[PDB]
Nucleic acid binder design. Structure first.
Ligand SMILES: [Cl-]
Ligand SMILES: [Cl-]
Ligand SMILES: [Cl-]
Ligand SMILES: [Cl-]
Ligand SMILES: [Mn+2]
Ligand SMILES: [Mn+2]
Ligand SMILES: [Mn+2]
Ligand SMILES: [Mn+2]
Ligand SMILES: [Mn+2]
Ligand SMILES: [Mn+2]
Ligand SMILES: [Mn+2]
Ligand SMILES: [Mn+2]
Ligand SMILES: [Mn+2]
Lengths: 85, 99, 108, 96, 97, 78, 104, 94
DNA sequence: ATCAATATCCACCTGCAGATTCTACCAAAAGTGTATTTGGAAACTGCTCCATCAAAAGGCATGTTCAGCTGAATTCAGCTGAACATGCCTTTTGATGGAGCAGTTTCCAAATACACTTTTGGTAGAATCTGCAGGTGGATATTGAT
DNA sequence: ATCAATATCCACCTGCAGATTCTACCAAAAGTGTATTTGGAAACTGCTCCATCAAAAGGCATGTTCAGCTGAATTCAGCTGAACATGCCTTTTGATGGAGCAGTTTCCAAATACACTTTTGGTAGAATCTGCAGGTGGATATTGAT
């Protein structure tokens, strides 16, 4: 990534979180929801990326493929349609 | 006037607008960095197929939208219209994500 | 020898029976696969997809579009009590959600 | 020196034309369909595999597929699938 | 005439049953209901002793867990009394609805 | 029959669940819930019974049924 | 002269190996797979019995019963999560009352 | 006799190693039996899929390890991965 | 918060009933010694993609100002739900039988696996076809202030 | 009870990125001809399961009382939405390079395939002991009076 990647969870802006809550039908949002959502999202991604990477290392590859991600999502009971090629 | 909408009207306009569309609500690049950063801490020098990141973004957004749905039901159950951390906690607990 | 007749044409199906049979043999599901199994399964798959394309085609038509897209599939699936049950733990990429605003949120 | 990958795409397209002669499908939509066919396939074959196992049988037959279908699918969707499945078998065995 | 205050006995009951592990529903009533329900699917069926006990262990466990979630929903709404509304929210979120 | 699951019985289950106060509407709501539970499981249990060509529902049949429903049970053969 | 003793285990390498090939998991099963698998099972079992053994001790029982297993399991965070969707017949629940429910 | 087999002898042996003074009721043992069968299927099952995804026909200790890494939470995984590789080595040594 | 007067828990104890543990014997499995295959790993090598960076444009995130109206606090009592004493009967539980049926064996006709060979249906680019994304405008609601 | 003010639709158009077709091998079905495996079709067996039959002992269904929780009705300090001006940095396209999937070959360490021999693990009565049922006696609390 050339430049060190740091503190990117802050890339998930207040507005991007607001649009997500809207789609989920939320009308009013407390001020503390933003950090909480960042904390929950991080846990969600770590859990999935972890399993995905494990499939990658196991295939002795250096490239995380959509399949690795698809298989990891399924393990978490989070099945995804559209990326099996 | 200057014309000014009442608090909640535009919020409602936005709800209708996003429940009607399917585009990703989080920006691409920023989401991409987050994924590479998190992954970087598990195994260094990993590469990613463009599709891998897209799959991750589709899954995360669908997950959050759904969480907000449940979170909203919790807030409403407490006679509120405003979602708060306690709502996301109650929902994650009931879902069995943090029982 | 006799002219070739595909197992799909024999069962009167569009889904590949030979394909499915191979997939079953090589998926380590059992030591042996009966002749009727791939027919039955290949037919159920065809039935289920024909059943979702029906509903998605309509949704596409309700939106004055001639091409089915992920959103039409979501609408179809989530608006059908049973399909939704079946795909309750599945997510359709680029599917969005069903419009639904909790009444208490509407202006009073 | 080719790398050919199989898919359910042509079959899904033939079925789409049957139920909607005037409709087409975006490749991304086709991607959802292919994911769907593989998901159900595995869910069904999986249950069938266990069935034969619990019953000490080494062969998965149309009977195992059938009960798996009654186990995985909700109400009406199941009766329907059973109909199509049974119909296809009887027609196939009669070399019809 | 001695008379405990409302709640004190309910609490004493909570400690009692959370400490024990026996089935809380009467055997015959349950068994009879299982057979009845079973009839609406397959006919003239026989049941193994252990099969009915297995179903009962699962039910109680299931209802107990549901009541725990229901309780969290009631407490979330500033109440201490569970209401149908609480069971409904809980099942909504568990994906049972 | 569903009435066989009495009020004091539902109270007990709720107690182990930590519930201190109960609305009178709860008992019938709980019977409805319980019913759907038994149906979903017994449906599959019996289906396992019928595939094995048996007339007797075994503990395993139930165990497999609980497993499919994501309610894995321990102590009855599986 | 059994494989279990050759791996320093109590759990059945031979039987684990047989369950693996008969289980329709793959056309072939390597030599070390059963060893590794038997080991993980022995480790998980030891882990639970250890704690359940304690629970039985603190209850003054010489015999472990389901209550003890359910206690061992639910009070340990990782085991609880491993068995989050499992139910222990005759295990009951962890005593626990929500603070708002207590008087004074 | 045929009838059926369980893990009873083995579970009783591990118990004696950790609590020589302790025993186990019939039901608790029934529970351990279930437990063992359950974990077994989860790992063998995950190992099966792992092997299939990479187009491998044989299931080795490498697939069991990754399966354990995927199924066990944190520390439980670390200790299981150690006991496993540990057992392989000994088995392979003598 | 104390006293007093109940009311419930909670060890601890004894006498056994009945779970466990302990013994002794096999069928069923695992272990052995040889003998032969073969999945897949190591060694290249073609060439897809993926990592990164450059530029220009402009879609969006940010910080700021205000004040609408939502969450949080309170108060009050109507009436729901808990605690209890009663009286009844449904659930326990204890036999006794009869038999509906899981469980097993021995065969064999009917169904599957497999190596070899034909015969396409499928798939990967090219070569065509075209929806409908983006743009434009008036027509129609939908608000919010008067 | 309106009307500027804005946002939301609806219908029309066009050409180019994204489907659909058209081509042509060719991987992989399907057709043959054997070589195994099976699923049961009968015929028998001990069982676990229903069926009744019959005391009765908790447990539950009821009817009273009334403590105190759930909601309704208010109040109002601030948080959070609505609008704006800024100007940062995400999007879009493409260019470079070369990291690393994927495709092929070659060939052993490792896995399968028998033929037998050893060793287990499952069973079921016998021989232990360990909880359990009841009974206290003494903590621990509750609840009402002051
Ligand atoms: Cl909060
Ligand atoms: Cl068949
Ligand atoms: Cl309610
Ligand atoms: Cl191995
Ligand atoms: Mn049609
Ligand atoms: Mn080879
Ligand atoms: Mn309010
Ligand atoms: Mn009052
Ligand atoms: Mn052709
Ligand atoms: Mn448009
Ligand atoms: Mn040989
Ligand atoms: Mn022995
Ligand atoms: Mn006692």
């Amino acid at each position: 990534h050339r430049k060190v990647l740091r503190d990117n969870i802050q890339g998930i802006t207040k507005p991007a979180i607001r649009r997500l809550a809207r789609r989920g039908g939320v009308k009013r949002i407390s001020g503390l929801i933003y950090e909480e959502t960042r904390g929950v999202l991080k846990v969600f991604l770590e859990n999935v990326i972890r399993d995905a990477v494990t499939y990658t290392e196991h295939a002795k590859r250096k490239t995380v493929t959509a399949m690795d991600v698809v298989y990891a999502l399924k393990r978490q009971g989070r099945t995804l349609y559209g990326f099996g090629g | 006037k200057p014309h000014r909408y009442r608090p909640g009207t535009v919020a409602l306009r936005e709800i209708r607008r996003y429940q009607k569309s399917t585009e990703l609500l989080i920006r691409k690049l920023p989401f991409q960095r987050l994924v590479r950063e998190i992954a970087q801490d598990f195994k260094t020098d990993l590469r990613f197929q463009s599709s891998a990141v897209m799959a991750l973004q589709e899954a995360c957004e669908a997950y959050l939208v759904g969480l907000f749905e449940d979170t909203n039901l919790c807030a409403i159950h407490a006679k509120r219209v405003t979602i708060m951390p306690k709502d996301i906690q109650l929902a994650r607990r009931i879902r069995g994500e943090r029982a | 020898r006799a002219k070739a007749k595909t197992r799909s044409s024999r069962a009167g199906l569009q889904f590949p029976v030979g394909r499915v049979h191979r997939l079953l043999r090589k998926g380590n599901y059992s030591e042996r696969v009966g002749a009727g199994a791939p027919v039955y399964l290949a037919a159920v798959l065809e039935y289920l997809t024909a059943e979702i394309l029906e509903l998605a085609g309509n949704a596409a038509r309700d939106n004055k579009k001639t091409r089915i897209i992920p959103r039409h599939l979501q609408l179809a699936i989530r608006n059908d009590e049973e399909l939704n049950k079946l795909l309750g733990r599945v997510t359709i990429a680029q599917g969005g959600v069903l419009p639904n605003i909790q009444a208490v949120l509407l202006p009073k | 020196k080719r790398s050919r990958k199989e898919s359910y795409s042509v079959y899904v397209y033939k079925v789409l034309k049957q139920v909607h002669p005037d409709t087409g499908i975006s490749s991304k939509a086709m991607g959802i369909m292919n994911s769907f066919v593989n998901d159900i396939f595995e869910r069904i074959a999986g249950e069938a595999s266990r069935l034969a196992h619990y019953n000490k049988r080494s062969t998965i037959t149309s009977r195992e597929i059938q009960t798996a279908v009654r186990l995985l699918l909700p109400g009406e969707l199941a009766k329907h699938a059973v109909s199509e499945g049974t119909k296809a078998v009887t027609k196939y065995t009669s070399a019809k």
